[PDB]
Amino acid sequence: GMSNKFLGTWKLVSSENFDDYMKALGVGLATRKLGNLAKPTVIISKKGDIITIRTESTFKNTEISFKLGQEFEETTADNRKTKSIVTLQRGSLNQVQRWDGKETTIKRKLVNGKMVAECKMKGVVCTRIYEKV
Ligand SMILES: CCCCCC/C=C\CCCCCCCCCC(=O)O
């Protein structure tokens, strides 16, 4: 299952190309401006086989709970209603969100003890690096 090294609290320390990623998602300017300033914490926890990913920031909080391989309904931080799934691949915790004929992926992987989230929509790739705190 998911590595226990994911469990805990993570703080954003770097974000590359997030504005264009939000644009690709259809997020408007005022929201993007606040999204570009946000430096969330992400809390990953488990209970049994249910994993929870909670994001906290001044602007927006989100939370998803899921079992690996089992599709679920999600509310995103930009207020999309998606059909989502999280699965593993080579230890990477990989999320797909689908809505309205569109798709985005968020792949969260451990790299030298940092959590790296790669976020792809259309051609746009955004990389967000988190430190464990
Ligand atoms: C919830 C805090 C970060 C987002 C703040 C701006 C809100 C809405 C715009 C849409 C953002 C959707 C992507 C959220 C980030 C996913 C990748 C990550 O966990 O780093």
Written as six digits, the tokens of 92 are 């990477």
Domain ranges of the chain: 1-133
CATH assignment of 1-133? Answer: 2.40.128.20
Experimental determination approach used = X-ray
Q: Please tell me the distance from the alpha carbon of residue 10 to that of residue 131, in angstroms, as a whole number.
A: 5
| Measured torsion, CA atoms of residues 133, 84, 106, 46, in degrees rounded to the nearest 10 | 20
| Measured torsion, CA atoms of residues 14, 5, 91, 129, in degrees rounded to the nearest 10 | 0
Q: What are phi and psi of 79, to 5 degrees?
A: 75, 30
Q: Please tell me the distance from the alpha carbon of residue 127 to that of residue 120, in angstroms, as a whole number.
A: 9
For ligand 1, pick from 34, 59, 107, 124 the residue to mutate: most ligand atoms within 8 Å of CB: 59
CA terminus-to-terminus distance, the chain: 23
Cβ atoms of 33 and 66 closer than 8 Å:
no
Return the DSSP state at 13: E
Residue 126, ligand 1, Cβ within 6 A: no
- Residue 108 marked in a binding site: yes
Residue 38, ligand 1, Cβ within 6 A: yes
